[PDB]
Amino acid sequence: MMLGPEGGEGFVVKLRGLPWSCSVEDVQNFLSDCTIHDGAAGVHFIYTREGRQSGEAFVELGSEDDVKMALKKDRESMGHRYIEVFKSHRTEMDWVLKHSGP
RNA sequence: AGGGAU
């Protein structure tokens, strides 16, 4: 937009939730109205040398319509655990996909 | 390590 508030600048979103670990098939199942830019070729995650995920991840998408639809469930659940989503701009995604740590 | 405010 250019006449209202914002929270990002790209067709990318952040992800958080699920057990200490997950897979690209669970995250794409949760954004069941969107596209992951290429699927298992647009997923991302964050972790440390200690041997576990940091608790967060990202999901690239195909268009502005997918990022909007991903935010429509920003705190929903799969049915036995809950999930989180937030808007992004991909610069932050790159900033931690290559600099994550304890 | 844990449900944070993303």
Side-chain angles (χ1 to χ4, degrees):
Chain A
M1 293 299 183
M2 62 179 180
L3 48 61
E6 278 294 350
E9 297 184 270
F11 311 151
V12 176
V13 296
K14 319 188 192 188
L15 214 303
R16 174 190 291 180
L18 307 187
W20 296 145
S21 298
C22 55
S23 300
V24 343
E25 300 185 90
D26 300 296
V27 64
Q28 65 184 259
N29 129 98
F30 176 83
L31 295 320
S32 61
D33 311 288
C34 300
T35 293
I36 301 88
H37 194 95
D38 286 305
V43 78
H44 283 292
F45 296 103
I46 318 178
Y47 57 88
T48 56
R49 68 86 177 182
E50 183 163 82
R52 57 181 178 87
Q53 306 307 116
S54 302
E56 302 184 295
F58 302 92
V59 183
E60 297 184 299
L61 316 163
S63 299
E64 177 176 88
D65 188 53
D66 295 279
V67 39
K68 287 177 177 294
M69 283 191 304
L71 300 169
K72 299 300 175 178
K73 64 267 290 182
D74 72 315
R75 297 182 60 250
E76 300 309 297
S77 60
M78 286 174 183
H80 300 106
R81 197 68 188 204
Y82 108 91
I83 296 90
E84 267 188 62
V85 200
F86 194 92
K87 198 173 181 177
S88 189
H89 51 96
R90 202 177 187 264
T91 305
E92 187 178 295
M93 183 279 293
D94 190 62
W95 182 95
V96 57
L97 253 298
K98 296 189 178 63
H99 190 234
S100 56

